[PDB]
Each structure stands twice: as C-alpha cells, then as structure tokens.
Amino acid sequence: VSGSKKTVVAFIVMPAKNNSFTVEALKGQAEVRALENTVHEVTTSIGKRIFDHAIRYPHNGLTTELPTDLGELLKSSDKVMLKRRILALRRPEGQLPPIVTHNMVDDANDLILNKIRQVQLFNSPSDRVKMIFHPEFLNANNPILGLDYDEFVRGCHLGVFPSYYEPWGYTPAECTVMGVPSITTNVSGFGSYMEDLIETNQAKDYGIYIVDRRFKAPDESVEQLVDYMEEFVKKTRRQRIN
Amino acid sequence: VSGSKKTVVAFIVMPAKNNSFTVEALKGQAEVRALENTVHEVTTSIGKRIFDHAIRYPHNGLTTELPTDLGELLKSSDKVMLKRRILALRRPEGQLPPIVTHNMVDDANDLILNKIRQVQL
Amino acid sequence: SRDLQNHLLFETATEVANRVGGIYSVLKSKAPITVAQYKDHYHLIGPLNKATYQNEVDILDWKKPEAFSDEMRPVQHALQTMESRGVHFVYGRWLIEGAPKVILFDLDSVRGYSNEWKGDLWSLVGIPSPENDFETNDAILLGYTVAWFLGEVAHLDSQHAIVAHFHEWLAGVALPLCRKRRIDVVTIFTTHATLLGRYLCASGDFYNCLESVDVDHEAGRFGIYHRYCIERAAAHSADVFTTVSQITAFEAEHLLKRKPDGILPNGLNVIKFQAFHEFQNLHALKKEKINDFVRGHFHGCFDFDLDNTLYFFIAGRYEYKNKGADMFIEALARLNYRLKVSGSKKTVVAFIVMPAKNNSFTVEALKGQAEVRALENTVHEVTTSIGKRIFDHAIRYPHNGLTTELPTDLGELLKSSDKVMLKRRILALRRPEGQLPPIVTHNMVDDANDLILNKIRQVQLFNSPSDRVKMIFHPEFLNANNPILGLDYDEFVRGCHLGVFPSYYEPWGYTPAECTVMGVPSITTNVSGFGSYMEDLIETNQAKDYGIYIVDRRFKAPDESVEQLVDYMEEFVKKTRRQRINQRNATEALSDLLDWKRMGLEYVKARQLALRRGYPDQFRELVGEELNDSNMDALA
Numbered sequence A: 001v002s003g004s005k006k007t008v009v010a011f012i013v014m015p016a017k018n019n020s021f022t023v024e025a026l027k028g029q030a031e032v033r034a035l036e037n038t039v040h041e042v043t044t045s046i047g048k049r050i051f052d053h054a055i056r057y058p059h060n061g062l063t064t065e066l067p068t069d070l071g072e073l074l075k076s077s078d079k080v081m082l083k084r085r086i087l088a089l090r091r092p093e094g095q096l097p098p099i100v101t102h103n104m105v106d107d108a109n110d111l112i113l114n115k116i117r118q119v120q121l122f123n124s125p126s127d128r129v130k131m132i133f134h135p136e137f138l139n140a141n142n143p144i145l146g147l148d149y150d151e152f153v154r155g156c157h158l159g160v161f162p163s164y165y166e167p168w169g170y171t172p173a174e175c176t177v178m179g180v181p182s183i184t185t186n187v188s189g190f191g192s193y194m195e196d197l198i199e200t201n202q203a204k205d206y207g208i209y210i211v212d213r214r215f216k217a218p219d220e221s222v223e224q225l226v227d228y229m230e231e232f233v234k235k236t237r238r239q240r241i242n
Numbered sequence B: 001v002s003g004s005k006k007t008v009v010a011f012i013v014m015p016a017k018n019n020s021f022t023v024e025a026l027k028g029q030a031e032v033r034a035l036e037n038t039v040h041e042v043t044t045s046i047g048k049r050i051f052d053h054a055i056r057y058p059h060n061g062l063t064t065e066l067p068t069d070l071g072e073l074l075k076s077s078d079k080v081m082l083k084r085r086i087l088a089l090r091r092p093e094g095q096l097p098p099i100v101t102h103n104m105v106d107d108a109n110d111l112i113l114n115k116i117r118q119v120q121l
Numbered sequence C: 001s002r003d004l005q006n007h008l009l010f011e012t013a014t015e016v017a018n019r020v021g022g023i024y025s026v027l028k029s030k031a032p033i034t035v036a037q038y039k040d041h042y043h044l045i046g047p048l049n050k051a052t053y054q055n056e057v058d059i060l061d062w063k064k065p066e067a068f069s070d071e072m073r074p075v076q077h078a079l080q081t082m083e084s085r086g087v088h089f090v091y092g093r094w095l096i097e098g099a100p101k102v103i104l105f106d107l108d109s110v111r112g113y114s115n116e117w118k119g120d121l122w123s124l125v126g127i128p129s130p131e132n133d134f135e136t137n138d139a140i141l142l143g144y145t146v147a148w149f150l151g152e153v154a155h156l157d158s159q160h161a162i163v164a165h166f167h168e169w170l171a172g173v174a175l176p177l178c179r180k181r182r183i184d185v186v187t188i189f190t191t192h193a194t195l196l197g198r199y200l201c202a203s204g205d206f207y208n209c210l211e212s213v214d215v216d217h218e219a220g221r222f223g224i225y226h227r228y229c230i231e232r233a234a235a236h237s238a239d240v241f242t243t244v245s246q247i248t249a250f251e252a253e254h255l256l257k258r259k260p261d262g263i264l265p266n267g268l269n270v271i272k273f274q275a276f277h278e279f280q281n282l283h284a285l286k287k288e289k290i291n292d293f294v295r296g297h298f299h300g301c302f303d304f305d306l307d308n309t310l311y312f313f314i315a316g317r318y319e320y321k322n323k324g325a326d327m328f329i330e331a332l333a334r335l336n337y338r339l340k341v342s343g344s345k346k347t348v349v350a351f352i353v354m355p356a357k358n359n360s361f362t363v364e365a366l367k368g369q370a371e372v373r374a375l376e377n378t379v380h381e382v383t384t385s386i387g388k389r390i391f392d393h394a395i396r397y398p399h400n401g402l403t404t405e406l407p408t409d410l411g412e413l414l415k416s417s418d419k420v421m422l423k424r425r426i427l428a429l430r431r432p433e434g435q436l437p438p439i440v441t442h443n444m445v446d447d448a449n450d451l452i453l454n455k456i457r458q459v460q461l462f463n464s465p466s467d468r469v470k471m472i473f474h475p476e477f478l479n480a481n482n483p484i485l486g487l488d489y490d491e492f493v494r495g496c497h498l499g500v501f502p503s504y505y506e507p508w509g510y511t512p513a514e515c516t517v518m519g520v521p522s523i524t525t526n527v528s529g530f531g532s533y534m535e536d537l538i539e540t541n542q543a544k545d546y547g548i549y550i551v552d553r554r555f556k557a558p559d560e561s562v563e564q565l566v567d568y569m570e571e572f573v574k575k576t577r578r579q580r581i582n583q584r585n586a587t588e589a590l591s592d593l594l595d596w597k598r599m600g601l602e603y604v605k606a607r608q609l610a611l612r613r614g615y616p617d618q619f620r621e622l623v624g625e626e627l628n629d630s631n632m633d634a635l636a
C-alpha cells in the first residue's frame, strides 16, 4: 500500500517431523555455487587482459590507458559458460520460491504451513514479505545454511517472539545479548521484566518492542505487532546500527 | 631486415664484481607487482557485478543475460586506481631498459659491458 | 537603501584557482557550505594563473543572457564594463565540489596601468614598491583591478548589499582603496598569518618579547616594509578584521596594531561514514600495511611483537625548528630511556615524514621488502600442501590405521622439501653480523648535513634491539604508488596510533586537524592555531581524554616543554587496547567541531558584523534595535 522499496525475509526456525532437506534446496545452493566459481574463472581471464593492456600502454596502438570496450575483456567462451550457469538457475514456468526447506512428514496437517497457505504468502515477486520455514534446529554442519543458532541470530535484523505463554523469554534475552532488537509480549517473563526495568516508552529506543497481549483483544494485538514491524522497516541503516 | 615480429631476449649469466642489484631493477619489479595487485582488486569488484547481473536476470529491467557495457562493470574509482599504477610504470622520457641488473664495481672497464656498448645493443 | 537580507558576497585571494598554500585548500573546502547558502549570489575573485587555470576551471560563456539571473545582471554589466576598457578575464566555475562561480583577472592585460597605480598607491596610502618585487607588483595590479570591478558592481546594483571578503595581504590592496573611494560595499579582511610574525620566528624568544617590538623597524630590518604596509593597510581599511586562530589574533594585535573582531578557524569538508565504527575498521586494515613495511625494514632483526607496538609520526614541510622535529626527536630519546628504565614491554616505532633532497629508496629498503614477500609466497605454498594432507587424514579417518581424527605429529604435514625452502627463505632475511635496521629509507643527497639525521645520530637512536623506541626517517611525501610503504597519506595516518606535531609558528594546525578528523589522537602546542583553538573549547586535562595533547610552548622553558611532551607520550604508551579504542572514538566524535557545517557559522558572524557596521541603521530597523558592535561575539 505504501509502495515501500524494502523487502522482509522472515524465518521460522521450529523443529517439526521431517524427512530432511528437499533436493530443490540443496540443488539451488549448488547451482549458485557453480555460478560463483564460473565467475571467478572469468574474472581471472579478464584480469590478465586488463594487466596486459596496462603494462603495454601506450605501445602497439593502445591509445587509452585502459580498455574501453567490454569486448576486449569478455570473450565468447566466457559468455557461453556464464549463460549455461544462468540457465541452470532458471526455474519452471510459474514456479515460485518454496515456503519450506525440508520435506515434511505430514505436510497437509502442519499448523505452520497451513497458516502460511491461509494468509497466502507464497513468495511472489509482488510480495514485499518473503516466508521461509526451516523446521529444524540450526547448525554449522547443515548443507544449506551453515550457521550455528547464535551466528544466525547475529546476522538477522529483528527477533519476533509474540509469545502467549512464556514464564521466561530465553530467546528474546539471548537475542538481546547479541545486540539484536526484538519483539516480545507483556505476558512473557522477559517482556514483563523489561517492562519494569526500562522507562515505559524508552524500550523501543533500546530495541525492545513489547506487544500488549494482556489488556487487548487479539486483533488489537496483531495490529500493534504490525505497527512495530512497520516502524522498524522504516528505519535507515544508520538508525538500525545505532 | 626480414620484418620478423619475434623478439630475442639474451641473458648473460657470468659472475663479476658487483655492488648488488640496482635500485631500478628492484623498483620496476615492485611497481609491476603493485599493478598486478590492483588488477586483482578491480576484477574482484567486477566479479561481484557480473554475479549480481547473472543472479537477477531477467528481473529489474535486465534485458540481457550478461552485462554489455563495460561501464556497468568498471567504476571510476577502479579507473583512478589503475591509471595510477600505470603512471608509476612510466620511465623518464628517452630512458631505455638497462643492459645490466647490478651496480658494477668497475663498470667502465668491464669486458662484457664494453662489448655491448660497442655493438650498441 | 540596500537589502541586508538578500545580499551579495565576493571572496578574493591569490589562491583562487592556483594551489600555492593552505589558503587554496581553505577556500576549496569551504565552497560547498557557502555555495549552499548563496547559490549564485557568491563569487570568487583571483589572478588568472594562465599556466594552470585550464585544468582547474570550467571556462564558461559569460556572454549569454542565460549566464546570469535577472537580479544578477549587475555583475554581467560590470563585466562588460571591464570588457570595454580592454580588461581580459576568465569566467566559469571551479572544477571542485560546490562549483562556485569564479572570476579570474588576467593581470597582463592591465600591467600598463602599473606605473600610474604604483604612484597613486604610494601617494594615497604611503606604500612604496621596489621594481624587483614581482609579488607586490602583481598584488597592486590585482588590488586595483578588483576595486575597479567592485566599484562598478556597487554602481550597477541597487538592491543587494555587497560583502567583499579578502584573504591575506597579497589580496588586501583593494581594501585601502574601497575605504578611500567610499565605495558602497562592506569589507572583511582575514589574515592567515602575519608578515612580521613569520620573519621574527624565522631565526631563533618571540611569543614573549613581541608585545614590545617596533613594527616599523623590523619591517625595514627584514626588507619587508612595503609588504608590511599593505598588510597593515588592508588590516585597517576593512570593516571587519579577523584571523584564523586566537594565537594569531594575539600577534596581529601587537604587530598590525588592531585587535581582531573575531576568529575564523579553518574547517574541513569532513566525509562521514554511514557506520560510525567504520573508521575503526579502516585503522585496523591500514595498520596491517604499516605492519608489512615494518617486517621488511626490521628483517633479520625482528625481536618485538607488532600486537604490542605503537606507531607515532610527525609530518609536514621540512622545517626542523618550526615544526618541532628537534623536540620530537629529543623527546623520543628521553621516552626511550624511560621505557627501558621502567621495564616496559611495549615498542614504539616513530616515523618522520618530511620531504628532503634524496636519490630515492635504498637498495636495502627494496631488497628487504622483496625477501619478505618471497617468504610469504613460500609459506603460502607450504600451507596448501599442509592443507591437502590434513584434508586427506580427515576424510579418511578412521580407516587405514588412522586412530586419531586429526594429525598429531608435525612430520605428517611438514615434509623435508617444505623445510628446505622455508629455511632458504629465512637465510635470505638474515643480515650481516652487527648490522642494524636503518634510520632512513632513502639515499640522501646530503646525508652528513641533514638536520633530522644529525639530531637522530646525536641522541643515538640507532634501532638497537635494546631500544624500545625505533626511528624511521622517510624523506618523501607518502604516496600509494610507492614501492615500500604503499599508502597515501590519509591511509597512513589512519593506520597510526598517535600524531606528534610540536610546532612553534603555526597560525593554523592543518596537520593535527586532519589527524583528528581521521580519528587519530595527536600532540599539538598552545602556540599552534589548532592548539589554541582546542584549549578554548575543552579544559586542557579533559582534552587528553579526547585524544588532544596540548604542549605548552608559550610559558614553559624549552626543556620544560620537552619533558611535558615526553610525559604525554609515556602516558599514551601506557594505555591498553581498550583505552586506545575508546580514546579514538572520542577524538573521532570531536571531528564534527572541525567541520565546515559548524566552523562555517563564524564566516556568517563575520559577514553580519560587517553588515551591522556598514549600515547600522537598516540593521537597527531589520532587527528592531542595535546590538553591541565591538566583537563578532558581542553581536551574537
């Protein structure tokens, strides 16, 4: 509606019964890896040609210090293999980026997947919010996202933990310890603790967003959660860093 | 006379009393080494730009699989950088590549150097 | 009746398009901030440097009616006036950020009027002009060709008030005129030094015995009387008189007999990073480049830890006394003794970067750096070999009698062939028995007579293993094109830990200022314009927390000043990494006060002090009242 230029990629990391990664997940990462390797070979070739030109100038008809035409640097064999690499990344007509990285044991009955389907976030180009369900604990040893949980957290921008029952928020706290802002609720122990510890409306400045799930009807709650997220999305890199 | 385009570089490797390598010999090699290093940096940048193009085609208005304009790949800071390494390789006008790599103890009376000077290679 | 609100501004100086001295850099870096305010109401005036201006200027066609706005026509008709009278000039825009409009006058096509003007000047103001002084000649030329132009503009324009700012005596000639001719323009004069000031300090006290000098005698004494007269004249004629620092505002009052109305400190176009901590990452990267040089320089004698090593430097024109190279070296010799006495484990490598006559880098310098490069390459080869053997073990475990997951014996990874070549690399780094790391990186044209080198030898800093302070003289400007320390100057500063600039005569500390903006702590002095500016802003003890160490050279005796310099250095050496990191953050935050976005407000106060002195009435009417006009500070 606001015609924002931002994009949110949202991760759900909760273990569910699964038959491991999809061939598609592993296949896609391998194909991106192959494009990078091919690009490395091409830049090596481009390198020698820039170097020769530079070391030879201004002799043998070289009127400019540097190559000016791409054709001098990028040859046909280079183009051919780059395009084969690009073709391998092409997906079937009308096929969209999956919302899940694993083969579920019981895909049709899964609560998380059913919800995503119901709200209809299928990762289409016009969708400003992307959805990724990774139904397994993170670990540096896994073939698609080789990060331990703490590393993953550090790399993200925002933790969102809208808990209904949660005596203590280990997760938002751990999130906090690593300088990652997060969203919590006033019915979680962490939220209630921070509600008290920090002046009322200062928490947001410290990256602690607290949703009222105690004295608000569910719809009010959701709209406040959205208010928070939308506010964060508005931030500059500078604001995010501070 | 034969219009041949080949070049012969001839090496004379015979020990003579010397005061080690000239500053020129060492400096030239370092200057080339620096050009090489900068080229590596630039091509790393270029690779990033080629990769990005390759991974996002054909979205965001990319009509071709590959970049076609060198300007999409080579930035102005890249050029300033490279042009500087080129300027450092420039010899004082009129100066030719030396016929010897070392400072000689008795340069004026060296048999080999005097021979080269006489036939004017 | 002219508008004090929508007015014009003209800035005149010799350096308006030709890089002569610090003023070029001041006017250039100020462009963006002033062009943002005046838009097209602002112009720079200077002599046309025919040899260079073509690379500096975007020569434009001032003839078009489209080359000016309607309310700016006056300038176009005043330029036409000059064009009728046969005066050649160049119009266009500086090829810098902000693209200020520039008016360069070809003094050639005016030189005929010389004899006439020279005489007129000598009789209207009392300013002689020996024929051989080409500088004062071109000064008078410019001065008249400017007052000429200004007078016409005041004539052709009736709406805008007119402000005429002049920088340095070489552009002050037009000031006594305007005062006489009674032209309708408010004028400001800024001096970035004083003539008497330099010359008195060019020998060997001053900051004490100067309140009582005879100005007119020393002028003649130095053969600078006529030049001095233009400085004084310019200083007295103008509505508002200013200098660049308080320390210079002192010498200006006693040597030009007029207490300046205020200070116009020099700002910088400080480029800021999106991420505040970025300058910190840059420091770390740049320091590894210095590290690499150091390993080469100390090859065969590398007995200290670079993780526990600090880099000090001094840089600037080669002015042994005036920049305090002598204090710097004497202090380092005393620092060395203190560090050895106290059993410190830290090492200080000190760089002196001052251009001197040389025959380029030594063979030893180039040789050493090559032999280190060769070792690096050999190590790289050996490790890819080790990698393949670690990899094999790993992917093969637990088969084929492999009982451990990882190799446990070095012999499994490092083979005989690898050992042989690594050892040959080590052998090549060895230096002749009893040879020490040089104290200079270049072959000097005149080694025996060099002041820096004599001083280093006198205090005996020869880079012995037992010396906790190392000395490196690099008698050439830093450039990233250089073979051994391939860093541009700004990169080198970022990589260092502490700048040390014990200056004596320094109207403005360009160097310490740059150094601060790079987020690097520095030692300056109270007689430095930058130092005097800083000690009026932060209490001299609080200052140190912000990485600003101010040595007293006005009130302490020289040996006292030296001991204080040593004190500061030693205090800095004792800091931890965490304290060094925090200090840098602090000095980097200071940098915002050095930016034109703040310093530029002073240029604002000066222009309004002149608009309130020029038309005290239209200013009592536009403000509602009259405010104090004894200072730039009184009016605000």
Ligand SMILES: O=P(O)(O)OC[C@H]1O[C@H](O)[C@H](O)[C@@H](O)[C@@H]1O
Residues within 6 Å of the ligand: C280, C281, C283, C284, C287, C497, C577, C580, C581
């Ligand atoms: O050069 P020093 O004062 O020891 O500072 C070293 C520190 O520099 C920067 O802060 C880097 O980001 C740190 O990784 C580094 O440890």
